PDB file of C-alpha atoms in Angstrom:
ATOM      1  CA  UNK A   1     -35.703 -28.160-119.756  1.00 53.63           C
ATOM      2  CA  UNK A   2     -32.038 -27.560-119.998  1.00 54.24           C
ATOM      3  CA  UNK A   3     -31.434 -31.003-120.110  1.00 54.42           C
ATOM      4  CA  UNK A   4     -31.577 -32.109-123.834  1.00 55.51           C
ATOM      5  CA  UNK A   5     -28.255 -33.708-125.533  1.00 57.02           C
ATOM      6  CA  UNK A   6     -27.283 -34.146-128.871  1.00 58.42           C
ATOM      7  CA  UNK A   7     -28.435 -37.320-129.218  1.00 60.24           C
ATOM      8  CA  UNK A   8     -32.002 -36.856-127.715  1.00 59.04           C
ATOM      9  CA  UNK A   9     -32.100 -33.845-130.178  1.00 56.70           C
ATOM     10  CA  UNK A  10     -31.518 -36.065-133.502  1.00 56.14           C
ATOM     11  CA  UNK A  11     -33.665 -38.738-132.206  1.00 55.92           C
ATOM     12  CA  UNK A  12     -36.768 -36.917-132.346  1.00 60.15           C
ATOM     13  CA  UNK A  13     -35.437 -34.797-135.201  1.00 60.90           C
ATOM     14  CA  UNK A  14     -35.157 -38.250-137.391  1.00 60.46           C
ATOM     15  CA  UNK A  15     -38.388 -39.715-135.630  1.00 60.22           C
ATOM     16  CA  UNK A  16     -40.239 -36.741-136.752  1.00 61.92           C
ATOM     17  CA  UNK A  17     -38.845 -37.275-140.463  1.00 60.25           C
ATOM     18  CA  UNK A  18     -36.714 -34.420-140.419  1.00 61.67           C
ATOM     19  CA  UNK A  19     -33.974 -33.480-142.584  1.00 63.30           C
ATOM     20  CA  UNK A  20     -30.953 -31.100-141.135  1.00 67.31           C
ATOM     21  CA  UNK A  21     -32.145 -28.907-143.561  1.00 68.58           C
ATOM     22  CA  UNK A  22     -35.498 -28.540-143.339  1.00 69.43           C
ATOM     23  CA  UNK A  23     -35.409 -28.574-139.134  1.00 67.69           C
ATOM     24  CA  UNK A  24     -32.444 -25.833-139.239  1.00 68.47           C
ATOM     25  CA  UNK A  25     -34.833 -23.827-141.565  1.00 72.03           C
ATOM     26  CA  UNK A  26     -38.100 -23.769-140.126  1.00 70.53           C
ATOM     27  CA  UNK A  27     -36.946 -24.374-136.312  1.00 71.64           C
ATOM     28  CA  UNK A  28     -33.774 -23.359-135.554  1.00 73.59           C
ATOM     29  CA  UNK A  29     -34.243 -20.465-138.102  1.00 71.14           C
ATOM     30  CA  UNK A  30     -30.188 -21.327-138.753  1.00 74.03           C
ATOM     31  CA  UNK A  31     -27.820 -22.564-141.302  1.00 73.77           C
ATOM     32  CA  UNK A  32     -27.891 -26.566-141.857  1.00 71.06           C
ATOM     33  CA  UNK A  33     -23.797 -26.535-140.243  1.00 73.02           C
ATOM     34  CA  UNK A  34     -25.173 -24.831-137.189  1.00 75.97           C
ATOM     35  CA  UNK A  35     -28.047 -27.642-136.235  1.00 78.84           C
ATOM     36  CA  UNK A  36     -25.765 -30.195-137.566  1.00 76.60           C
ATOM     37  CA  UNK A  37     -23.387 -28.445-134.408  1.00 80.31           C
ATOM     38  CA  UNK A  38     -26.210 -29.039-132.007  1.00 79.13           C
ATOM     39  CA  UNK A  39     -26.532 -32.825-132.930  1.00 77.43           C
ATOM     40  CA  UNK A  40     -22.764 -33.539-132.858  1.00 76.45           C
ATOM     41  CA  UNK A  41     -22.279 -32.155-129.369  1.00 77.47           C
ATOM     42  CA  UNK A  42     -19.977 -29.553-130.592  1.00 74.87           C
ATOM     43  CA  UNK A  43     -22.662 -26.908-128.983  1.00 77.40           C
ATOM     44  CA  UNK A  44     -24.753 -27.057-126.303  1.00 76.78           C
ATOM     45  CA  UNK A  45     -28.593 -27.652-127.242  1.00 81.70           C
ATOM     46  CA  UNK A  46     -30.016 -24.428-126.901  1.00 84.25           C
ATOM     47  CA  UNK A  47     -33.328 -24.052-124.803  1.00 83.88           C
ATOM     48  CA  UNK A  48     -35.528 -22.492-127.207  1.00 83.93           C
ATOM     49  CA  UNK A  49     -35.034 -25.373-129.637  1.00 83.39           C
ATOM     50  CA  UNK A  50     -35.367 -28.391-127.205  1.00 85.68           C
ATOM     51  CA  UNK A  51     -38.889 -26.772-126.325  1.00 86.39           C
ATOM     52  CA  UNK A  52     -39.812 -25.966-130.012  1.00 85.96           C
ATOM     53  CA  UNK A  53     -38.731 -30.018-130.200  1.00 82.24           C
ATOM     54  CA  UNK A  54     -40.910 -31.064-127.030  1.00 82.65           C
ATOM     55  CA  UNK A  55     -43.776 -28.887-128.492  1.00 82.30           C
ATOM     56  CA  UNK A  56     -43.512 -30.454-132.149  1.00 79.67           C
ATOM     57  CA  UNK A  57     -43.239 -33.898-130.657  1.00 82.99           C
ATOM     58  CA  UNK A  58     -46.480 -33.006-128.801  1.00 82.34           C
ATOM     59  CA  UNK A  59     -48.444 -32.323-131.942  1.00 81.58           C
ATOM     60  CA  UNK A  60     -47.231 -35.765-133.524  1.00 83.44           C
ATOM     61  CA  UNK A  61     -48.489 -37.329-129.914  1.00 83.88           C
ATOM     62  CA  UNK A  62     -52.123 -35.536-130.407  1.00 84.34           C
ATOM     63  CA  UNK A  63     -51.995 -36.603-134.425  1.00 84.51           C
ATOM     64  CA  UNK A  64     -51.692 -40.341-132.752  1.00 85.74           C
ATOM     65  CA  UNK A  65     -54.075 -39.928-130.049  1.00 86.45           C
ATOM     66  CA  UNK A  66     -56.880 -39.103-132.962  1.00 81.06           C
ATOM     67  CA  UNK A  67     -56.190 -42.178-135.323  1.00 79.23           C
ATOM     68  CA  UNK A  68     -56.168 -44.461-131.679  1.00 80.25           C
ATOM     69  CA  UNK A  69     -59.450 -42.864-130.802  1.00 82.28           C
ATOM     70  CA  UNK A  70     -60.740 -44.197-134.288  1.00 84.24           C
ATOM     71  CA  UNK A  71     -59.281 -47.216-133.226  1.00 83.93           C
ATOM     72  CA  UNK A  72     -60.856 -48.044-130.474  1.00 83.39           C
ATOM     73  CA  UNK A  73     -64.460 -46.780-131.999  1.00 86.85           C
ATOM     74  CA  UNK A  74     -63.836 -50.041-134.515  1.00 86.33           C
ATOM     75  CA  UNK A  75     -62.388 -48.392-137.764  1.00 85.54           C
ATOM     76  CA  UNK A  76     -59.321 -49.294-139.590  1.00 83.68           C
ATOM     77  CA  UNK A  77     -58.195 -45.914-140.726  1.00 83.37           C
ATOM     78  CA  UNK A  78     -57.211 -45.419-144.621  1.00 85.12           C
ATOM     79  CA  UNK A  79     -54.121 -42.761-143.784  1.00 85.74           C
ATOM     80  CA  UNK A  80     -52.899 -40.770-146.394  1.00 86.29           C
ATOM     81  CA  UNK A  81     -49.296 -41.279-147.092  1.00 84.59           C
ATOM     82  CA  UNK A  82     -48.447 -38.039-148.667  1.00 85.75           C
ATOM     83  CA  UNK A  83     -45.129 -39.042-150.839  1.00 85.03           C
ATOM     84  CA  UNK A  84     -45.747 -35.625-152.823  1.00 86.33           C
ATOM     85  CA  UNK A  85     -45.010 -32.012-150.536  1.00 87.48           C
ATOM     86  CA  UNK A  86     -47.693 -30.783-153.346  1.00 85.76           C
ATOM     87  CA  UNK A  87     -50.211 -33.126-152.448  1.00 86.18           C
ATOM     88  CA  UNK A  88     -49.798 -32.764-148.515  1.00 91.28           C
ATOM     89  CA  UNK A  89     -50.572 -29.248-148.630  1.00 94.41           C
ATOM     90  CA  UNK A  90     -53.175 -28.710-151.274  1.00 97.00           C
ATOM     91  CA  UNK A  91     -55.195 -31.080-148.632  1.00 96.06           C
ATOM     92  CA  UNK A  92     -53.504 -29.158-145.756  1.00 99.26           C
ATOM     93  CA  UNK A  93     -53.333 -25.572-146.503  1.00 99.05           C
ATOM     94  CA  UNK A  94     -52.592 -24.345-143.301  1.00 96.60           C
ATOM     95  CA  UNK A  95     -49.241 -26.565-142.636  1.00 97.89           C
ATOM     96  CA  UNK A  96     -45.912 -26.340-144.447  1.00 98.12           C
ATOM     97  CA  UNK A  97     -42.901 -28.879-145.050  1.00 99.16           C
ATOM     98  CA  UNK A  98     -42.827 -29.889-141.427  1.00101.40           C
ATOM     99  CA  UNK A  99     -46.112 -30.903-141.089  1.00 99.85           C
ATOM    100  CA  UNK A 100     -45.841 -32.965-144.067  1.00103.45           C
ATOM    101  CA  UNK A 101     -43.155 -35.019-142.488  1.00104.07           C
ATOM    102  CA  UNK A 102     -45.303 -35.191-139.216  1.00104.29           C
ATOM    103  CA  UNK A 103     -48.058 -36.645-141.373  1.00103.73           C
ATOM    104  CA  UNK A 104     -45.675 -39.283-142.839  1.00103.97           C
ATOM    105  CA  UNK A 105     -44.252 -39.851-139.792  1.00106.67           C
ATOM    106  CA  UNK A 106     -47.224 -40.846-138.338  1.00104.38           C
ATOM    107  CA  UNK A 107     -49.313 -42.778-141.514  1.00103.73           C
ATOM    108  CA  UNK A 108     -45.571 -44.798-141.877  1.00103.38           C
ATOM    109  CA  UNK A 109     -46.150 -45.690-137.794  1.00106.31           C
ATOM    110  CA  UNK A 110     -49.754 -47.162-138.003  1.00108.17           C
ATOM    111  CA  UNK A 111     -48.847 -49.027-141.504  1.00106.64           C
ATOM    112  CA  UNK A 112     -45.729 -50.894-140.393  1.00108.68           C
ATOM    113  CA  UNK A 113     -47.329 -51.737-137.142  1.00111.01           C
ATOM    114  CA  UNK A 114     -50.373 -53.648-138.635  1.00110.93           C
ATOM    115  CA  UNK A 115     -52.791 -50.855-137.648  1.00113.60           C
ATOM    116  CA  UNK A 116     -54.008 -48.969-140.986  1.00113.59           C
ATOM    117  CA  UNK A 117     -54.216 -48.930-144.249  1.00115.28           C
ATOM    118  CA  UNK A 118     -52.179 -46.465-147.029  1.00115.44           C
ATOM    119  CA  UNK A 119     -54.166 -44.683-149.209  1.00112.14           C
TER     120      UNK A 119
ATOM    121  CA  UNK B   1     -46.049 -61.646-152.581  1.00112.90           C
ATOM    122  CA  UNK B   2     -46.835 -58.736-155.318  1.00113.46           C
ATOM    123  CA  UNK B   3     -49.339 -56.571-153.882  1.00111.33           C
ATOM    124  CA  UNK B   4     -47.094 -53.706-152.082  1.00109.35           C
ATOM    125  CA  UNK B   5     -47.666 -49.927-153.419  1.00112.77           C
ATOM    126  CA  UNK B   6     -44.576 -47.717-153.705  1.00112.20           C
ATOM    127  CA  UNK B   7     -46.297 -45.334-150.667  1.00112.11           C
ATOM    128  CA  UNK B   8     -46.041 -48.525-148.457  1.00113.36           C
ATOM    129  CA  UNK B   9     -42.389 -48.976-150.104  1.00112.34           C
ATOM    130  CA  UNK B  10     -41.547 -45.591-149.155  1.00112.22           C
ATOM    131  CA  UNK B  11     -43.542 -45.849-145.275  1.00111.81           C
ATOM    132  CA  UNK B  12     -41.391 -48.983-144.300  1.00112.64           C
ATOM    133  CA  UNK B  13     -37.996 -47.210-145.950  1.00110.03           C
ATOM    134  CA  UNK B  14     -38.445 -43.943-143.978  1.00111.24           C
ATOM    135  CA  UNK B  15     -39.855 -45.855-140.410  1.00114.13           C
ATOM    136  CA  UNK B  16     -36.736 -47.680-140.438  1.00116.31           C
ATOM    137  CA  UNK B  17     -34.727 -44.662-141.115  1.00116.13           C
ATOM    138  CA  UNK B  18     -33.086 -45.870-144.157  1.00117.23           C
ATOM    139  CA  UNK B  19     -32.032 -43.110-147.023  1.00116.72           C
ATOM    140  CA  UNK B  20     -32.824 -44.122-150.811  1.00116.83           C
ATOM    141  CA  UNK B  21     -29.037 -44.613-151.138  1.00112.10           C
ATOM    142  CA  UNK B  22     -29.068 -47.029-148.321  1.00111.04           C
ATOM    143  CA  UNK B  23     -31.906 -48.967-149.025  1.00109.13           C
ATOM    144  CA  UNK B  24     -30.696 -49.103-152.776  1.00109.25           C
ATOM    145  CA  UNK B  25     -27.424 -50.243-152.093  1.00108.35           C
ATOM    146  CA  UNK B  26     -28.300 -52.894-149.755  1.00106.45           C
ATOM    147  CA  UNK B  27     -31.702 -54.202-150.114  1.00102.12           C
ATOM    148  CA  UNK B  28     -32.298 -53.250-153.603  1.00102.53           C
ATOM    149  CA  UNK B  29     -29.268 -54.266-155.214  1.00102.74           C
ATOM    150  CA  UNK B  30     -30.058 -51.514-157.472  1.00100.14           C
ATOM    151  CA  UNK B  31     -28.873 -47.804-158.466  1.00100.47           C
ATOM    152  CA  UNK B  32     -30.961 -44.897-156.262  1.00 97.74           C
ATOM    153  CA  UNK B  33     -32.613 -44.307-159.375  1.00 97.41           C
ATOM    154  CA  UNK B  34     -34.040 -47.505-159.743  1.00 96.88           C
ATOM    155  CA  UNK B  35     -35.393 -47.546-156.431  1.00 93.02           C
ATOM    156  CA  UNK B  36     -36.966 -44.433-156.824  1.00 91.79           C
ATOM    157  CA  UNK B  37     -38.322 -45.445-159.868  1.00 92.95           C
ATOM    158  CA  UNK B  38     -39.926 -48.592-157.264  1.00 91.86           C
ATOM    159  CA  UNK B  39     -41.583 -45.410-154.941  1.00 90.55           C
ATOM    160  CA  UNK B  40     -42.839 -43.630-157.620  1.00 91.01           C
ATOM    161  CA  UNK B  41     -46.035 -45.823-158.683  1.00 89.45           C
ATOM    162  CA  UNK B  42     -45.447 -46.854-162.429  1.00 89.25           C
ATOM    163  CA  UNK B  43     -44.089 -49.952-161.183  1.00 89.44           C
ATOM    164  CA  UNK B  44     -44.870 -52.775-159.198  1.00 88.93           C
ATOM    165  CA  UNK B  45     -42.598 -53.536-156.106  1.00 90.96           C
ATOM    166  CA  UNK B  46     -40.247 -56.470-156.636  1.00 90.63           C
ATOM    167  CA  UNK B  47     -41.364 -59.614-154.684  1.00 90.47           C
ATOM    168  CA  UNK B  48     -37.933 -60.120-153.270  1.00 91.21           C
ATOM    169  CA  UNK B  49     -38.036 -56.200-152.069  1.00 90.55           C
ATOM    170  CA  UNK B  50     -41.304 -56.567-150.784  1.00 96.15           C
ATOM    171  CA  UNK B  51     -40.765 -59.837-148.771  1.00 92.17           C
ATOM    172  CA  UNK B  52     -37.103 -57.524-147.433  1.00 89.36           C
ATOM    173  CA  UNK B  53     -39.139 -55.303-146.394  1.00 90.72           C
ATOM    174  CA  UNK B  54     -41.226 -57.227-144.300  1.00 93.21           C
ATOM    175  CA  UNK B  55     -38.661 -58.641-142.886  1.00 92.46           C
ATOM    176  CA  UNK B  56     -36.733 -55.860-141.772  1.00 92.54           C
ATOM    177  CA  UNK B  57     -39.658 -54.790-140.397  1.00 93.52           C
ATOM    178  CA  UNK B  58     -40.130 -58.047-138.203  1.00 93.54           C
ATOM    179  CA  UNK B  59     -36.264 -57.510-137.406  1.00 96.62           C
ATOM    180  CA  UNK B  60     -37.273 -53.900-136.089  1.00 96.66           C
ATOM    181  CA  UNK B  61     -40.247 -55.617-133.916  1.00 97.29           C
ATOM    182  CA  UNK B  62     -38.048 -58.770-132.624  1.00 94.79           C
ATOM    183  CA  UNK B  63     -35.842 -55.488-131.346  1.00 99.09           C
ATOM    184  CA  UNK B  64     -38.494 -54.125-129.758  1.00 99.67           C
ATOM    185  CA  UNK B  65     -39.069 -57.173-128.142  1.00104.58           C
ATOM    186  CA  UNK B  66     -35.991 -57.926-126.241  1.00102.46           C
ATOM    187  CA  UNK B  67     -35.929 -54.242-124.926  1.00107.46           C
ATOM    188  CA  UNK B  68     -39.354 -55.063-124.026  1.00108.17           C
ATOM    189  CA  UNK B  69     -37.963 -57.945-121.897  1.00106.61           C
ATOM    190  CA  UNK B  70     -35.372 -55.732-120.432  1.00107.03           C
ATOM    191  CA  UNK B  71     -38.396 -53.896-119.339  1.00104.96           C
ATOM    192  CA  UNK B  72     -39.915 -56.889-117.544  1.00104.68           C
ATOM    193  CA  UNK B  73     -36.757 -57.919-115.701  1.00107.04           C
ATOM    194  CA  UNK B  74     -37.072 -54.409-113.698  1.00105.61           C
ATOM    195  CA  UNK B  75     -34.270 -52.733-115.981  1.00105.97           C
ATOM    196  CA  UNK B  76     -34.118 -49.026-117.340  1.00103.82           C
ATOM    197  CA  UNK B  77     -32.596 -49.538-120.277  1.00103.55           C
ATOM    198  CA  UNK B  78     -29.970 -47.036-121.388  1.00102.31           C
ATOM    199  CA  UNK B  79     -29.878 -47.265-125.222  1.00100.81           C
ATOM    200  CA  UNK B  80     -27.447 -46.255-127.169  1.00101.64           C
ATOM    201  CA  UNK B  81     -28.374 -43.849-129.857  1.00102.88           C
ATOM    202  CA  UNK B  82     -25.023 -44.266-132.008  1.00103.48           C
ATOM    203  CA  UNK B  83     -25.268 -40.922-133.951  1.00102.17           C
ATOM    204  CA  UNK B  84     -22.169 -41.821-135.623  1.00107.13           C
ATOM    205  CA  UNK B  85     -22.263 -44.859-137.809  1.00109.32           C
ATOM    206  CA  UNK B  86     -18.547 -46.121-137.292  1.00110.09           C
ATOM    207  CA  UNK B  87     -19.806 -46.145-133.518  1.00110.51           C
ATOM    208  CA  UNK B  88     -22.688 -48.636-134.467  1.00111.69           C
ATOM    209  CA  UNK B  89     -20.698 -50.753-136.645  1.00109.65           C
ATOM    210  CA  UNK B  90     -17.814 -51.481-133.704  1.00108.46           C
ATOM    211  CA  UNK B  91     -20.174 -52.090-131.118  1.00108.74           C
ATOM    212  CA  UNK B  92     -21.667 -54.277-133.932  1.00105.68           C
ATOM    213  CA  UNK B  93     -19.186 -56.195-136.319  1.00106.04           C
ATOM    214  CA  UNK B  94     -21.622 -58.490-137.592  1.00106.33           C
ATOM    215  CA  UNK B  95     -24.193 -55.488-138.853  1.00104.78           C
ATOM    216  CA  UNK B  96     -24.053 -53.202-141.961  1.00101.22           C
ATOM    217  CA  UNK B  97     -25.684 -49.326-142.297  1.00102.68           C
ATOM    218  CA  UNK B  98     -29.129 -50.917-142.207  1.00104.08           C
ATOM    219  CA  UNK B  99     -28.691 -52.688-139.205  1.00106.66           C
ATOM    220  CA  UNK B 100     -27.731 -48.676-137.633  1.00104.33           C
ATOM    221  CA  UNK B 101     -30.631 -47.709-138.899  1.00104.46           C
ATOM    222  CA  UNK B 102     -32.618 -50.074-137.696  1.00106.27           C
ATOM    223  CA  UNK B 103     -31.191 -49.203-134.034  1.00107.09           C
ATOM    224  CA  UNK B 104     -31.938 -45.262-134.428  1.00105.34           C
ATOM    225  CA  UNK B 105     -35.198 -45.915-135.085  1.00105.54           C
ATOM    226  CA  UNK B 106     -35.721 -48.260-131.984  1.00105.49           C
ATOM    227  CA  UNK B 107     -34.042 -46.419-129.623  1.00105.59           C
ATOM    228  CA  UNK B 108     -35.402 -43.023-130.775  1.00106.01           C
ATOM    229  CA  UNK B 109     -38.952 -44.439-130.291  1.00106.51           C
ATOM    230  CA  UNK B 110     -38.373 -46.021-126.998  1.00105.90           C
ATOM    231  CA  UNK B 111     -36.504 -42.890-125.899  1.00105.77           C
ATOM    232  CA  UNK B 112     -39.536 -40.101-126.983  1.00106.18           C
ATOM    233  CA  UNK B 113     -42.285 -43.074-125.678  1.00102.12           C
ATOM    234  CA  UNK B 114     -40.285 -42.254-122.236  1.00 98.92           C
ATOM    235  CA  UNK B 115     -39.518 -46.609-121.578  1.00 99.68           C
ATOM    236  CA  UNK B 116     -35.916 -45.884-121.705  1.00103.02           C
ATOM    237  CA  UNK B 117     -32.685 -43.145-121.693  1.00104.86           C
ATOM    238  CA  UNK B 118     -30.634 -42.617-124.241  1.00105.68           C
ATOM    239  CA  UNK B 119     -26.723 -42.660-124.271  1.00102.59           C
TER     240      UNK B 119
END
């Protein structure tokens, strides 16, 4: 910790499915210009957000690790691909916006790769 | 050829990292309307969209495959995550705003599945 740069910071921002907006909002808890200062270098990468981003990537990790452990026990998963925010949380009441991009994140992964099915 | 549904449309767009207006522009040949109108369901996918798709996708996975190789030679790669598309298309003057896309989302997969650094 204490070591995250800009770039590392908008990598897993945009692998996560992220907008500026929506990651300034629910984890920075700052205006859109201020993360977008974080990701251009023009401020340091403070380190309350790079663990917030470590712990967020972690949850996409354990999402994974649960659709490889169908895997290997012979199913091809039918993921839902939640293209409607409404949809994802009626089905997920407990989440909000950034676990809807989480979810797509991770259904778009398995699709493209061959692996399952989008239902 | 035919068969693609506009959440698979929408799953290969956002894995690659490509914004409607992008993917309009460039793949599409169409306004951002009309390829929204294409992720929305009441339509079928365009063959030649589809089949662009598919092989961006295999362009993404032939990527993956010579940092793979960089792998097996003993190297630690250090890719470049361009945040900055100007940087991308210098280091790249035969590639377009896909082709940058195409590069965040390798490197910022290979950089959070801890294979390689990012510069």
């Amino acid at each position: 910790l204490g070591s995250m740069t800009n770039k590392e910071l908008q990598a897993i921002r945009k692998l996560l499915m992220l907008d500026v907006s929506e990651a300034a909002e629910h984890i920075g808890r700052v205006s859109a210009r201020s993360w977008q200062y974080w990701e251009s270098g023009r401020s340091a990468v403070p380190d309350d957000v790079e663990q917030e981003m470590l712990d967020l990537a972690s949850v996409r990790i354990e999402m994974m690790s649960a659709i490889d452990k169908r895997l290997a026990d012979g199913e091809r998963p039918k993921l839902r691909f939640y293209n409607k925010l409404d949809e994802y949380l009626a089905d997920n009441p407990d989440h909000n916006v950034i676990g809807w991009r989480l979810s797509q994140s991770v259904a778009a992964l398995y699709y493209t790769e061959g692996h399952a099915d989008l239902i």
